Amino acid sequence: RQESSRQQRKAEIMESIKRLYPGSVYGRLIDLCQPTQKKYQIAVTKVLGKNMDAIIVDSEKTGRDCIQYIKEQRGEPETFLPLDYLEVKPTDEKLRELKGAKLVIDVIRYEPPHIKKALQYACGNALVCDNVEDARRIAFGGHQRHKTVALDGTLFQKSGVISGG
Amino acid sequence: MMDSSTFKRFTASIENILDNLEDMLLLGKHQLNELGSESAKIKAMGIMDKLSTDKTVKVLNILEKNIQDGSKLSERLWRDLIMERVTKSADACLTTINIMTSPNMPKAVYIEDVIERVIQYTKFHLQNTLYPQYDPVYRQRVIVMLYNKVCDIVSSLSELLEIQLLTDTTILQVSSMGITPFFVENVSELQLCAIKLVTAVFSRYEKHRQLILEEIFTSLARLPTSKRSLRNFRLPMYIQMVTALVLQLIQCVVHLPDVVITNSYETAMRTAQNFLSIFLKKCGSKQGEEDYRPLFENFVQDLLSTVNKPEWPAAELLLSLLGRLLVHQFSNKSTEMALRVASLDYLGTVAARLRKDA
Amino acid sequence: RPVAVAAGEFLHKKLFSNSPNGNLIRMLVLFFLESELHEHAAYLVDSLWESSQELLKDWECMTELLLEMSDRQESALIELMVCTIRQAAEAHPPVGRGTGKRVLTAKERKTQIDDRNKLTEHFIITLPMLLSKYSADAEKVANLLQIPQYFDLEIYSTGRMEKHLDALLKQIKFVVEKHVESDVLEACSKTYSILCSEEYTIQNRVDIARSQLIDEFVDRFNHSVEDLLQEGEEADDDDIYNVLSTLKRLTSFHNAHDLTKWDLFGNCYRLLKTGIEHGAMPEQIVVQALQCSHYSILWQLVKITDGSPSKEDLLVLRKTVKSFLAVCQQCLSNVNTPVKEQAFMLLCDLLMIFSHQLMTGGREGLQPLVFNPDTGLQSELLSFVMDHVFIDQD
Amino acid sequence: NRQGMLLKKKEECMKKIRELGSLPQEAFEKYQTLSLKQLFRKLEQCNT
Amino acid sequence: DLAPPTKKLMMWKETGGVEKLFSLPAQPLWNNRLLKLFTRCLT
Amino acid sequence: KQQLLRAATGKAILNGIDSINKVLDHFRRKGINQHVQNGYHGIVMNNFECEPAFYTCVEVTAGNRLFYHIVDSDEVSTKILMEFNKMNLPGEVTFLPLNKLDVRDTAYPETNDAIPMISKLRYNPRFDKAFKHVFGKTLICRSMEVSTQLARAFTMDCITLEGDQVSHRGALTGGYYDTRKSRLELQKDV
């Protein structure tokens, strides 16, 4: 009811900000990437969570100026990742020898080359495993804990934080 | 990436050491080959952010290099000659990549001399070395190598010529060179890149069409008329070549930015009308020592084979004007007989296939 | 073979009574999964090839099912499809089934030409989508990589399809970047070897993209040599794994292609003699280093036969071969057994190549390189073969 | 404002000069006069 | 009598036998360019 | 009037608070395991104070860490969660366990263009490890450029008074921050 109209206003301002600064504002992560299989849509969107709406921006400055204009527009706070200064870590690939699970980043097909670093920042070394039983065993069974998600969307990170939904 | 200034750095080092060691007489085959291969994809985006007059002097240097084989006129000395040829063609690759690769460069970074040089070079080399060795009609690993080289040369040259404006003196030679290959046998790849070249040429400058169309018509006798290699433009379901060439031309000129739509469609129709009138009148009556009737037969059989696809319009336009021209042509009693005979035959065949498709 | 042929006729008439064709394929998949005797499909199609070939050419429907089923069934379906492709390409059946080595018929020749055309036109469109779909699975890509070995390469030119070629090279690149099992790397390298055939116009584009890949590979190699040579992280396992994975990729690509303009023998020598001095270097790293160095030697020897042999490269080549022979002699007594056997194989290889018979074939520059082993080394190798070959009782 | 409009007009001029593609020749850098009016009379002679 | 049910024994059976094993190197050579230097020197 | 706080709280948070309240009311009404109710100290929001100029910055700094429940022990957490799962209640509830808290040893910059947030928050000193965990790790910087420079040079989250934020890992989040949607203010006025 009321929330639907609110969502319409939010999506129209988001589109308006996208048109306002066309080159810098690439769009939402959905727009610029794709899940490989339909199966993994739920698990990928589950691991990303809040990151579903992260607007790709060139620079912090233009992001801020858009935030100012949005302040005039009375819009919800949004997240901008600037490719120039985004401080990402190289992909720890050493987990590719795990005989049961796979890297989550191995399930996204990205059209633009630059966005791969932001994808690494959003995924890190999160792992997607075949079933819940294996996911629990190889999440908690090592001396070090591992960030591991099962296909039903329960997420356990290396630090021991637990989340779901 | 953003810049990826490490192999940009590599090649920059290569270039400065090379032109320094030359300025203060050949670079050697390896340097030129690597520099060109790095120019293509590595310097697909990296050609920007360099020193301008530096480029001016190096392109002057490779120009003076190339001239060593301009009109080269060609048991070990022969090997040395073919060595000279492959070196100069590698240089040509380098230059034609450097002229085009960037979406933007300063003006006056490429002067017409490199244009004329590569044109006459390719013309002479091709028309005096390639055709004799592949077909005795007019008349080792490097031969097929240079063949591939010239394919890349002419494709890149097509793209560059499409990009910027040029001067008519070059236009005459480039047009003659691009129309030339369609009258020898085993040049399929050359044929289709040349198709691209001629249609770009036909696109840009709207004043040489009469000359290019007549110079197409001139060499109709020398056409292949061989079962093997007749239909070599894939799409089973092969079609002839010169018909593809003419249709591509006639469809090309639309110039879409009001009155533009009208005048463009009129320009297309007028060109087609002229082409078909010239063809039919020169074809019909039996002349001395030569006929055209099989040629027209193959043209129309191709047309009927290609009546309705998404990516070949104007064929129905050709058919409509053809029909009206035929019927308004053989009605009256002023022409001779055999022309009426041939026209009525062609109309019968095309009507038959039309009804059959129906 | 006749027994199998008649049995295939029996199967056809028993259980086979674009969309309808797929159901028969599903029935075949069930029959294949219930056979606990055979794990590959080459012989099912082989027995069916005479009588149900028209069913076997329904690649269209099979493509339809793959996009828009148990994942085990999909994997088996890909495998059988590859087997059908091989059977279509070459008339003779795989070894152990064919009485006659050569079978030629005019109908076979015409059919072979048409099959080649249809297979090419289909898989030029379909393969990148398949790689995108199953990139995580090593076995599926390993199967799929055998497909380009049979293409008529003219069709990339005549079909005006170079963009799909670009899609192929991008997707295969990503696949190379995500798997480390050796067989996929062998297959991909062989595919590039077929693609870099210098009788076809396409070669230059793929060679350039390959050169971009080799810049990537050498930069990782630069990191590897700098990390091992310096004190670094005191030989941490993670760095060793990174170097090993990269080294495996380098060896696999280097096996098929001359990379001699990049001297990567030097760094491997720099790490192998120091690894001998400590004596404690990972087995996989050293075996791959030995293999890549051997391949580098071989390719370096390739372009000294072109007809203009300078003598300075000839003597430095002799330097590199002799030094490598001495280091291989030093490491032949390394404690690691797979290193021992690989060193043995490579040593026998080098002695085979650089024999006295090398100079016989009208060879000028090949008299300086002939090497005859020391008799003490001869006895060392005989001891070695006695130790590692001649055991029949556990 | 005057400055912005002038800027736009000059952008139209640079657009033009990069469009034209007036193929230069070897005699270019030597024949460098800086007047913009003696230039104009040289241009008129060229026109004639 | 079943045919070989796995790939490994089939590839071994391809390059198996005294003549085939004795006529090709122990380390496979994927490019025939390398094959000619090898097969050249074998009397 | 008072319902505006609930309007500024969101139904997602409100249901989890009402649910935890029902769980504790079950504990109180059965009269067993009183240590649970005697060692539950409320949410973060009732155990600190701050100046109104930083209400936005503190709230978004914690986000929903403002609702972590101070408790004496794990046993309180597990019995609450046991009854919560048994009664099928809408999530979620957040605990601060005094026995288990592990806080990063941090040395604050001696910079004179940014101030430690912890120097401007008043909190209960029995809860020191809890407050060091929730608020002890973000710097307040003078400007957006100061915020960027400091969070790149140092391993700290940084935020401006006007709400421009930079994470210690590079994430940037920003938008319009209200004042009447604050909740600490009306808890102060009452």
Swiss-Prot record, chain A:
Residues 25-139 form the SMC hinge domain. Disulfide bonds: none annotated. It is found in: Nucleus; Chromosome; Chromosome, Centromere, Kinetochore. Ubiquitinated by the DCX(DCAF15) complex, leading to its degradation. Phosphorylated by ATM upon ionizing radiation in a NBS1-dependent manner. Phosphorylated by ATR upon DNA methylation in a MSH2/MSH6-dependent manner. Changing R6H: In CDLS2; affects the affinity of SMC hinge dimers for DNA; mutated hinge dimers bind DNA with higher affinity than wild-type proteins. Belongs to the SMC family. SMC1 subfamily. The flexible SMC hinge domain, which separates the large intramolecular coiled coil regions, allows the heterotypic interaction with the corresponding domain of SMC3, forming a V-shaped heterodimer. The two heads of the heterodimer are then connected by different ends of the cleavable RAD21 protein, forming a ring structure. Mutated Cornelia de Lange cell lines display genomic instability and sensitivity to ionizing radiation and interstrand cross-linking agents. This is Structural maintenance of chromosomes protein 1A. It comes from Homo sapiens (Human). The chain holds residues 491 to 655 of 1233 of the full protein.
From Swiss-Prot, chain B:
It is found in: Nucleus; Chromosome. Widely expressed. Highly expressed in heart, skeletal muscle, fetal and adult liver, fetal and adult kidney. Expressed at intermediates level in thymus, placenta, peripheral leukocyte and small intestine. Weakly or not expressed in brain, colon, spleen and lung. The modification Phosphoserine is found at S5. It comes from the Eukaryota. Contains one Pro-Xaa-Val-Xaa-Leu (PxVxL) motif, which is required for interaction with chromoshadow domains. This motif requires additional residues -7, -6, +4 and +5 of the central Val which contact the chromoshadow domain. The C-terminal region containing HEAT repeats and Pro-Xaa-Val-Xaa-Leu (PxVxL) motif are involved in the recruitment of NIPBL to sites of DNA damage. Plays an important role in the loading of the cohesin complex on to DNA. Forms a heterodimeric complex (also known as cohesin loading complex) with MAU2/SCC4 which mediates the loading of the cohesin complex onto chromatin. Plays a role in cohesin loading at sites of DNA damage. Its recruitment to double-strand breaks (DSBs) sites occurs in a CBX3-, RNF8- and RNF168-dependent manner whereas its recruitment to UV irradiation-induced DNA damage sites occurs in a ATM-, ATR-, RNF8- and RNF168-dependent manner. Belongs to the SCC2/Nipped-B family. This is Nipped-B-like protein.
Curated annotation (Swiss-Prot), chain E:
It comes from the Eukaryota. The modification Phosphothreonine is found at T43. It is found in: Cytoplasm, Cytosol; Nucleus. Residues 11-43 are annotated as: Interaction with STAG1. May promote apoptosis. This is 64-kDa C-terminal product. It comes from Homo sapiens (Human). The lineage of its organism: Eukaryota, Metazoa, Chordata, Craniata, Vertebrata. The gene is RAD21.
Swiss-Prot record, chain F:
It is found in: Nucleus; Chromosome; Chromosome, Centromere. Ubiquitinated by the DCX(DCAF15) complex, leading to its degradation. Regulated by DSCC1, it is required for processive DNA synthesis, coupling sister chromatid cohesion establishment during S phase to DNA replication. Deacetylation by HDAC8, regulates release of the cohesin complex from chromatin. Residues 38-150 form the SMC hinge domain. It comes from the Eukaryota. Central component of cohesin, a complex required for chromosome cohesion during the cell cycle. The cohesin complex may form a large proteinaceous ring within which sister chromatids can be trapped. At anaphase, the complex is cleaved and dissociates from chromatin, allowing sister chromatids to segregate. Cohesion is coupled to DNA replication and is involved in DNA repair. The cohesin complex also plays an important role in spindle pole assembly during mitosis and in chromosomes movement. Mutated Cornelia de Lange cell lines display genomic instability and sensitivity to ionizing radiation and interstrand cross-linking agents. Belongs to the SMC family. SMC3 subfamily. This is Structural maintenance of chromosomes protein 3.
